[PDB]
Design an enzyme around this catalytic site. Structure first.
Site, PDB file in Angstrom:
ATOM      1  N   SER A 196      43.145  70.188  33.426  1.00  0.00           N
ATOM      2  CA  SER A 196      42.110  69.959  34.425  1.00  0.00           C
ATOM      3  C   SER A 196      42.559  70.466  35.801  1.00  0.00           C
ATOM      4  O   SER A 196      42.804  71.665  35.958  1.00  0.00           O
ATOM      5  CB  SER A 196      41.742  68.477  34.456  1.00  0.00           C
ATOM      6  OG  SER A 196      40.450  68.273  34.997  1.00  0.00           O
ATOM      7  N   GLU A 323      33.505  68.555  27.096  1.00  0.00           N
ATOM      8  CA  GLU A 323      34.090  68.402  28.422  1.00  0.00           C
ATOM      9  C   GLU A 323      33.222  67.565  29.350  1.00  0.00           C
ATOM     10  O   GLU A 323      33.739  66.816  30.179  1.00  0.00           O
ATOM     11  CB  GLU A 323      34.339  69.769  29.059  1.00  0.00           C
ATOM     12  CG  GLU A 323      35.294  70.677  28.294  1.00  0.00           C
ATOM     13  CD  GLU A 323      36.770  70.354  28.523  1.00  0.00           C
ATOM     14  OE1 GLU A 323      37.085  69.324  29.153  1.00  0.00           O
ATOM     15  OE2 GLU A 323      37.623  71.143  28.069  1.00  0.00           O
ATOM     16  N   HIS A 436      36.812  65.375  27.701  1.00  0.00           N
ATOM     17  CA  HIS A 436      37.743  65.848  28.714  1.00  0.00           C
ATOM     18  C   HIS A 436      39.008  64.991  28.738  1.00  0.00           C
ATOM     19  O   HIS A 436      38.939  63.769  28.883  1.00  0.00           O
ATOM     20  CB  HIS A 436      37.050  65.814  30.070  1.00  0.00           C
ATOM     21  CG  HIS A 436      37.814  66.472  31.177  1.00  0.00           C
ATOM     22  ND1 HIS A 436      38.083  67.823  31.200  1.00  0.00           N
ATOM     23  CD2 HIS A 436      38.313  65.969  32.331  1.00  0.00           C
ATOM     24  CE1 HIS A 436      38.741  68.118  32.307  1.00  0.00           C
ATOM     25  NE2 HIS A 436      38.890  67.013  33.012  1.00  0.00           N
TER      26      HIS A 436
HETATM   27  C1  LIG Z   1      41.713  63.560  32.059  1.00  0.00           C
HETATM   28  O1  LIG Z   1      41.418  62.684  33.149  1.00  0.00           O
HETATM   29  C2  LIG Z   1      40.336  61.845  32.757  1.00  0.00           C
HETATM   30  C3  LIG Z   1      39.848  61.080  33.987  1.00  0.00           C
HETATM   31  N1  LIG Z   1      39.186  62.014  34.907  1.00  0.00           N
HETATM   32  C4  LIG Z   1      37.745  62.223  34.667  1.00  0.00           C
HETATM   33  C5  LIG Z   1      36.902  61.015  35.078  1.00  0.00           C
HETATM   34  C6  LIG Z   1      35.456  61.474  35.127  1.00  0.00           C
HETATM   35  C7  LIG Z   1      34.587  60.392  35.733  1.00  0.00           C
HETATM   36  C8  LIG Z   1      35.123  60.005  37.106  1.00  0.00           C
HETATM   37  N2  LIG Z   1      36.489  59.487  36.985  1.00  0.00           N
HETATM   38  C9  LIG Z   1      37.004  59.085  38.303  1.00  0.00           C
HETATM   39  C10 LIG Z   1      36.263  57.909  38.846  1.00  0.00           C
HETATM   40  C11 LIG Z   1      37.164  57.424  39.799  1.00  0.00           C
HETATM   41  C12 LIG Z   1      36.944  56.733  40.919  1.00  0.00           C
HETATM   42  C13 LIG Z   1      38.002  56.339  41.725  1.00  0.00           C
HETATM   43  C14 LIG Z   1      39.291  56.673  41.343  1.00  0.00           C
HETATM   44  C15 LIG Z   1      39.470  57.392  40.171  1.00  0.00           C
HETATM   45  C16 LIG Z   1      38.422  57.753  39.426  1.00  0.00           C
HETATM   46  C17 LIG Z   1      38.369  58.463  38.219  1.00  0.00           C
HETATM   47  C18 LIG Z   1      37.339  60.546  36.449  1.00  0.00           C
HETATM   48  C19 LIG Z   1      39.887  62.647  35.876  1.00  0.00           C
HETATM   49  O2  LIG Z   1      41.092  62.456  36.043  1.00  0.00           O
HETATM   50  C20 LIG Z   1      39.172  63.509  36.726  1.00  0.00           C
HETATM   51  C21 LIG Z   1      38.749  63.054  37.978  1.00  0.00           C
HETATM   52  C22 LIG Z   1      38.038  63.877  38.847  1.00  0.00           C
HETATM   53  C23 LIG Z   1      37.759  65.182  38.472  1.00  0.00           C
HETATM   54  C24 LIG Z   1      37.054  66.011  39.339  1.00  0.00           C
HETATM   55  C25 LIG Z   1      36.781  67.319  38.953  1.00  0.00           C
HETATM   56  C26 LIG Z   1      37.211  67.791  37.715  1.00  0.00           C
HETATM   57  C27 LIG Z   1      37.915  66.965  36.845  1.00  0.00           C
HETATM   58  C28 LIG Z   1      38.188  65.658  37.227  1.00  0.00           C
HETATM   59  C29 LIG Z   1      38.891  64.827  36.362  1.00  0.00           C
END
Ligand SMILES: COCCN(C[C@@H]1CCCN(C2Cc3ccccc3C2)C1)C(=O)c1ccc2ccccc2c1
Ligand SMILES: *[C@@H]1O[C@H](CO)[C@@H](O[C@@H]2O[C@H](CO)[C@@H](O)[C@H](O)[C@H]2NC(C)=O)[C@H](O)[C@H]1NC(C)=O
Ligand SMILES: *[C@@H]1O[C@H](CO)[C@@H](O[C@@H]2O[C@H](CO)[C@@H](O)[C@H](O)[C@H]2NC(C)=O)[C@H](O)[C@H]1NC(C)=O
Ligand SMILES: *[C@@H]1O[C@H](CO)[C@@H](O[C@@H]2O[C@H](CO)[C@@H](O)[C@H](O)[C@H]2NC(C)=O)[C@H](O)[C@H]1NC(C)=O
Ligand SMILES: *[C@@H]1O[C@H](CO[C@@H]2O[C@@H](C)[C@@H](O)[C@@H](O)[C@@H]2O)[C@@H](O)[C@H](O)[C@H]1NC(C)=O
Ligand SMILES: *[C@@H]1O[C@H](CO[C@H]2O[C@@H](C)[C@@H](O)[C@@H](O)[C@@H]2O)[C@@H](O)[C@H](O)[C@H]1NC(C)=O
Ligand SMILES: *[C@@H]1O[C@H](CO)[C@@H](O)[C@H](O)[C@H]1NC(C)=O
Length: 527
Positions: A196, A323, A436
């Site tokens: 990612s 994804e 993802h």
């Molecule tokens: C493989 O990693 C899995 C988790 N995820 C994905 C989840 C998806 C839903 C939101 N989640 C946020 C919500 C939240 C709020 C406050 C603190 C932490 C978080 C997590 C993240 C990531 O790390 C991630 C996070 C952001 C991204 C942005 C652009 C591209 C890929 C990304 C991947």
């Protein structure tokens, strides 16, 4: 006593028992002066020397970051939350070495993802001991600054220049060049890999001249720099720095006064204002990330790629089947992890509004039209799957395919994969599919642990992906065995062959989702 002499002093490690053998682990080795006080927002400063023995026997502090608390008690989201204390004093790395000690091991260096706002190298799913035990490689991972403390930018100003988290990573790579031989590693055989925002980071080290002598080969999982979320324009970065100053009462006339003001704020006063620096905000928002800083990135990354100004070496690139689904339960109407999330054409249109705030009315119709040519008219779950695929194609798949085309066109071998297996232990509902981030535990070999309730098929698959990944690092070719194995062919811009990865059948296929990606590459930029 497990002791290695590094250039910054001596360090003490620990023995792990893994599958009847031993893995020597050095956890929490410092690689930079703590970015504290007047060092906040600056590039990482090099370490001098400590006398005594540093005890590398536990994971270090995770860098300051906001935590995901949307689903308390839920493993699915909390497995990504940091498992060590938070602190600005966070620039440490880890090292796993096979036993008995190797003499010239290939080194795999892991960069974690997290939207450039979160993440830490100490998560269970990033444990390098399995890879070290089974494939006899050295595994290194590092903590790097995320969020505003890592990517705040006043371009040209050394007090807050941008891309600090990327230089954090780069300094850890410099550490490996200077010290890995002492552990039994080959500094001339180093492979970066990450997922990612970690994979976007890996692709940026390819473009950045300062990184070029610090690694050999690259692996990109579910990310690349040409993704729509990965890189901020120079001035969008500055406008968010200024907005953050306003939100904390640090608005000044002099830039240095702005930064010196921000240096007095509690880390938490900064964390709580990061969300507000951007008008819109989608679940894929990157508030503070990489930008064209004039130093690490000397131009917009698409320029450097087009002109063929990057490191010339082999790459391994791939993406997961679903994804997009992960981002739908964090905002979009009708979606829950506790439902089958069957939605209507109306809710789909609202879903699109969430993810494409700046796009015209005509533009959102376009997307809708391209993704609704149903095979079966109902099929109640047509729209649910459409939205998932829209978000996934636009943000991860089509950019990874486009980067690989362009990179391959300059004469180095690339390999593309499509990961299609859903984990039997995946805590999220079934409708979310192959999510993802859920190939990672297969890449690090976690299913090889038979005490962990994985299927036999899953141990076979994981053992296979591990072998191919490690082989790519060593030989530039992700072969498994010479005989009784599917040939993984190179990705060429004409035929565009890729390999699918699952328990049923690993096949060779071509032009992955070309009909979908044609929309984003050739029509969406014109709306
Ligand atoms: C493989 O990693 C899995 C988790 N995820 C994905 C989840 C998806 C839903 C939101 N989640 C946020 C919500 C939240 C709020 C406050 C603190 C932490 C978080 C997590 C993240 C990531 O790390 C991630 C996070 C952001 C991204 C942005 C652009 C591209 C890929 C990304 C991947
Ligand atoms: C570890 O392996 C490397 C090969 O990747 C050995 O490499 C140096 O390798 C280059 C080729 O890239 C040669 O041109 C040099 O002459 C080599 N130097 C020496 C001193 O041999 C390296 O030597 C190996 N180190 C070991 C086995 O300890
Ligand atoms: C995978 O394929 C590579 C070919 O690139 C094999 O590499 C050779 O590996 C041996 C060690 O087993 C070396 O002695 C040779 O010098 C290598 N040659 C080249 C041209 O790289 C590798 O052995 C294969 N591995 C498996 C498990 O099949
Ligand atoms: C060659 O290797 C393949 C690995 O793909 C072996 O594959 C499978 O064999 C097991 C038996 O233990 C079956 O349960 C699987 O269903 C097979 N997978 C298929 C057919 O896709 C195979 O046994 C090996 N054969 C030889 C002759 O070495
Ligand atoms: C820069 O961004 C401006 C947005 O300003 C807003 O003020 C900050 C403090 C936040 O509260 C934020 O939510 C608000 O949206 C725009 O007004 C301005 O046009 C932008 N300028 C450029 C050059 O991008
Ligand atoms: C590191 O720990 C030291 C004590 O722990 C160990 O002492 C060694 C002699 C050896 O027996 C190990 O097996 C023990 O775990 C302690 O004296 C040092 O002060 C510690 N280092 C730092 C920097 O605090
Ligand atoms: C570390 O591992 C080596 C190699 O297996 C072993 O000989 C030694 O006793 C171990 N030291 C410990 C467990 O302190």
């Amino acid at each position: 006593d497990i002791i290695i002499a590094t250039k910054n002093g001596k360090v003490r490690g620990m023995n792990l028992t893994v599958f009847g053998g031993t893995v020597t682990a050095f956890l929490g080795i410092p690689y930079a002066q703590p970015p504290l006080g007047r060092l906040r927002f600056k590039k990482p400063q090099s370490l001098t020397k400590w006398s005594d023995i540093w005890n590398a026997t536990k994971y270090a502090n995770s860098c300051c970051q906001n935590i995901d608390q949307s689903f308390p008690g839920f493993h699915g989201s909390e497995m990504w939350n940091p498992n060590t204390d938070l602190s600005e004093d966070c620039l440490y790395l880890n090292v796993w070495i096979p036993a008995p000690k190797p003499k010239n091991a290939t080194v795999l260096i892991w960069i974690y993802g997290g939207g450039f706002q979160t993440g830490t190298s100490s998560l269970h799913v990033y444990d390098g001991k399995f890879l070290a035990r089974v494939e006899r490689v050295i595994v290194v991972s590092m903590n790097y600054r995320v969020g505003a403390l890592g990517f705040l930018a006043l371009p040209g100003n050394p007090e807050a220049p941008g891309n600090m988290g990327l230089f954090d990573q780069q300094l850890a790579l410099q550490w490996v060049q200077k010290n890995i031989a002492a552990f039994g590693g080959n500094p001339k055989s180093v492979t970066l890999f990450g997922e990612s925002a970690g994979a976007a980071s890996v692709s940026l080290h390819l473009l950045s001249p300062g990184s070029h002598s610090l690694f050999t080969r690259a692996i990109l999982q579910s990310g690349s720099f040409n993704a729509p979320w990965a890189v901020t324009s120079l001035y969008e970065a500055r406008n968010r720095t200024l907005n953050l100053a306003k939100l904390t009462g640090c608005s000044r006339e002099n830039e240095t006064e702005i930064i010196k003001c921000l240096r007095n704020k509690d880390p938490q006063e900064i964390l709580l204002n990061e969300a507000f620096v951007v008008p819109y905000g989608t679940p894929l928002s990157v508030n503070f990330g990489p930008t064209v800083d004039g130093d690490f990135l000397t131009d917009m990354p698409d320029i450097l790629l087009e002109l063929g100004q990057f490191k010339k070496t082999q790459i391994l690139v791939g993406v997961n089947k679903d994804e997009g689904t992960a981002f739908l339960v964090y905002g979009a109407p009708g979606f829950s992890k506790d439902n089958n999330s069957i939605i209507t054409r109306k809710e789909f249109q609202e879903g699109l509004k969430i993810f494409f705030p700046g796009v015209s009315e005509f533009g959102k119709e376009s997307i809708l039209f391209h993704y609704t040519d149903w095979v079966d008219d109902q099929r109640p779950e047509n729209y649910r799957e459409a939205l998932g695929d829209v978000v996934g194609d636009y943000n991860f798949i089509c950019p990874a395919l486009e980067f690989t085309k362009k990179f391959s066109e300059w004469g180095n071998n690339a390999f593309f994969y499509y990961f299609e297996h859903r984990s039997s232990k995946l805590p999220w509902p079934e409708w979310m599919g192959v999510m993802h981030g859920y190939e990672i535990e297969f890449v690090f070999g976690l299913p090889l642990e038979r005490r962990d309730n994985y299927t036999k098929a899953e141990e076979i698959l994981s053992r296979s992906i591990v072998k191919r990944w490690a082989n790519f690092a060593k030989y530039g070719n992700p072969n498994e065995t010479q005989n009784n194995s599917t040939s993984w062919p190179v990705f060429k811009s004409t035929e565009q062959k890729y390999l699918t990865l699952n328990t049923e059948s690993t096949r060779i296929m071509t032009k992955l989702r070309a009909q979908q990606c044609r929309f984003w590459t050739s029509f969406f930029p014109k709306v």
